[PDB]
Each structure stands twice: as structure tokens, then as C-alpha cells.
Amino acid sequence: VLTQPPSVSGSLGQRVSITCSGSSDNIGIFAVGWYQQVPGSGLRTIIYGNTKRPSGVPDRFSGSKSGNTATLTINSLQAEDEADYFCVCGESKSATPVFGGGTTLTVLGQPKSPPSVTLFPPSTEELNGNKATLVCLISDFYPGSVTVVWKADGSTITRNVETTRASKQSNSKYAASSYLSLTSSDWKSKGSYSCEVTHEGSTVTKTVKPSEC
Amino acid sequence: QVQLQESGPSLVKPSQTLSLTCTVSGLSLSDHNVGWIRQAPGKALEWLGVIYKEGDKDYNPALKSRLSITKDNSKSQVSLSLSSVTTEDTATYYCATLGCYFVEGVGYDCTYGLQHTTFHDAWGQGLLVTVSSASTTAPKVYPLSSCCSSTVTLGCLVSSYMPEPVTVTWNSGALKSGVHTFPAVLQSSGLYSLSSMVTVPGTQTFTCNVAHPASSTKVDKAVDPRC
């Protein structure tokens, strides 16, 4: 295995470097590559042959080596550079490529954004089958962490709640969703249901009342 | 200057055989090395093996001869099979080219995910395969209305399916402005659910088109915005 720092940070428009340490039987002899991956998405080649860039990779990415250690340097950091980076190198005693453990890059200075929240009640067709799903959709928040609490008539609900992790949207903000699964009979059992979403010490609350739908 | 696409089942039973295909577009496999790499949830990258353009092969010794890689140059397809799977084999599987180049003052070397001569990116998309005893289950699709002078936001709930993934479009692809499709949750039922929401501020109709390839099911749902 090649040794990488688990995490690095830089600010928008600044420089960051990521090291990759190995032995004289891999990095000392063979050509190092670098891959980029945004969590939930695929791999892209950034560097091959120690210092070379594939077609379409901008020149603010650069690669270097000295002895048994390789370095990836990223200049003029942008929001889109937030991702995981892995080094790779050949080995003298097998055809197996050796991978780094990966480095998570955070880009600081990005604008804060509170979540938009939409709460959907169960449809008539679902209620006809004696089931009732409430759907809380959470979008356009940065940074990418929220906590969700559900309530019925002001009392916190624990059972039958599932909440996704935050995932990065196309516009580089974050989204998540939370689901409350009930029977038709429990849906009507209460006066009101609430989805309460907390983000950076602020809370947004949406409510639906069965009597009004 | 190249395209690679992984295809095959997303669900395999324990102790049975996982099979995938890499369909290559815009190259002749007679001129390209093709290999397979996987990424387990949360963890390291692991090399599986490679079939060189000359037709010889190399495999990861750590997979204990459970692997088989074959090719058909006429159909532009590379095949992978992995026998006796366990939950350790649940992962995202990638095909890629092994492209070679001259390193000045050193010699020839190669890198996975690089096309030879042109030095373009050459990674497949990746396909998640889960090792599981669960049965295939087609989704039920329900309309979503925020009507419970209102600004009306509507959607489709894609409820209780197995396995991932599903695709959602609106009005057969014509409606895209104000569409947000969310990643799925896994409910305590042991089945997945996801939602697609349309936010618009008339003659306009709203129909969600849901496809679940694993069950070969398509569903069109009309959704009513008015109140």
C-alpha cells in the first residue's frame, strides 16, 4: 500500500499539495498516476507517467516525484476540486498495481446556505392500500450536514424514521431526504405532523394536518 | 476519445457467480488492453485483472482463481466472472483501458484509465453489485401534492423497490427546469424509496415516467397540481 494523508484543506483560489510515500520497488522505479473521485460518482485520471496530464485536465493540476515519494499539487482551488484523490504505482515483483488509501480534499471559503424544506403528506392511493408515507425533502444547504427530528402533536417520534446522508447537488450545494412510514390508521390518529431540520444552529419547521388533506 | 460501459445484474446470491460485461465504443479491442478494478463501500481500491490486446491475461493472486476474464473482438465486449461470492464482494466494479507510454530516460510504463497514443481518459462509469438473498421487487409510484393562492410543488414517490437503481423523467424528458430527483433511502421494510420533485411558478401537464430495469417495469403517473 502507498501512504497518503487522510485529509487536506485549502481555501478558494489557493494551493494544496498531497504526498504519496512508498518503497524503492514501486515509486522508486515505476511511473505514478493520480485519480480523482467525488463521493457517489466515478473515477477520473488526473496524472499519468509521474508528471503528464491526460487531454482535458487543466494545467493547475501538476504531479512530481523524488526518490520514493510522489506529490500532487492543485493551484487555484475551485469548489469542484472537493473530492478524494488516490495515487497508483506499478511494482517490481508482480503485475498488481499498488494504490494509496486516498486523501479527502475540503475547499474552505464557500458561501453558507440554509436548507429549503418541502413536506409532502400521503396520497389518497397510498392511504387506500392502508399505508401512509410522509416525505421531507431538504435541498440547497451548505455546508453539507443537517439533523432532522419528526414530531406528532409536539412529541418527538423515533420509530419508522429513515434519513439519507447529505449528497452533493449539480450546483455544489447539498441535498437529503427523510421518510416517516405509518399505517393509514396512525396517519389519522394525530392532529399534526412536523419535520424539523437543524443546520448550523438554525431550525426550519414544516407542518401538515390530516384534517386539511 | 473512448467510451466504456459496465452492464449486468445489480444483485447476486451468496455462493453463486457474479458476471459483468464491459461494452467498448469507438475502439477495436484487438488494439486495447482492458482491466477491471473494484471499490468496496468506504474502503480501498482493489485490482481484479487484465486481458492484454495480444490475448494473454493476469489476475490478482488474492482472488484465489475465482476470476475469469474473456473478450469477443467481434462484439467489442470484455466479460468478467467471479465465483463463490460473499458480502466481501459487494462493491462498485469498473472496467478501464491499460494504456502504455514511453517515460523519458526510464522505458515503457502503463496506467489504468488511460487510452494509448491519444492519452485521453478511459474509465468506465462503474456499476454497484450487492451480494444479497433479497428478491427483486417492482416499485409502487404515488403522486405527491403540497396542497395540504398556494405556491404548488408536486412530485412522484417511487416506493418499496429492490434493487437499485431506478430512473425518473417528467413528460418523457420534455420537462427538466425545476426538476430535482433525490437519492434513495433504505426503509426498515428492507426496500428502497426515492422521490422526484417539480417546483414551477395553465395548459401545463405533469407526468412522471419511472423505469426499474431489474424488474423490466415502466410506469407513467399523471400528477395534478391544481387546488
Numbering used by the authors:
A (entry chain L): 3 to 215
B (entry chain H): 1 to 148, 153 to 205, 210 to 235
Q: How did the manuscript describe this experimental structure?
A:
B4 recognises antigenic site II (residues 255–275), whereas B13 binds to an epitope contained within antigenic site IV, V, VI (residues 417–438).
The H3s of B4 and B13 are of different lengths, comprising 21 and 25 residues respectively. Both contain a pair of cysteines, at positions cys97-cys100G (B4), and cys95-cys100E (B13) (Kabat numbering) and structures of the Fabs revealed that they form disulphide bridges irrespective of the paired LC. The N-terminal loop of the longer B13 H3 adopts an extended β-hairpin structure contacting L1 and L2, and a shorter C-terminal loop folded between the H1 and L2 loops. Therefore, in contrast to the H3 of B4, that of B13 protrudes from the surface of the variable regions. Viewed from the top, the antigen binding regions of the two Fabs show differences in both shape and electrostatic potential. For the Fabs with more than one molecule in the AU superimposition showed that the 6 B13 Fabs differed by rmsds of 0.7–1.4 Å, the 2 B4* Fabs by only 0.3 Å and the 4 B13* Fabs by 0.5–2.3 Å based on Cα atoms. The large structural differences in B13 and B13* Fabs are mainly due to variations in the elbow angles between the variable and constant domains. Thus, superimposition of the variable domains of the 6 B13 and 4 B13* Fabs showed smaller conformational differences between the variable domains with rmsds of 0.4−0.6 Å and 0.8−0.9 Å respectively.
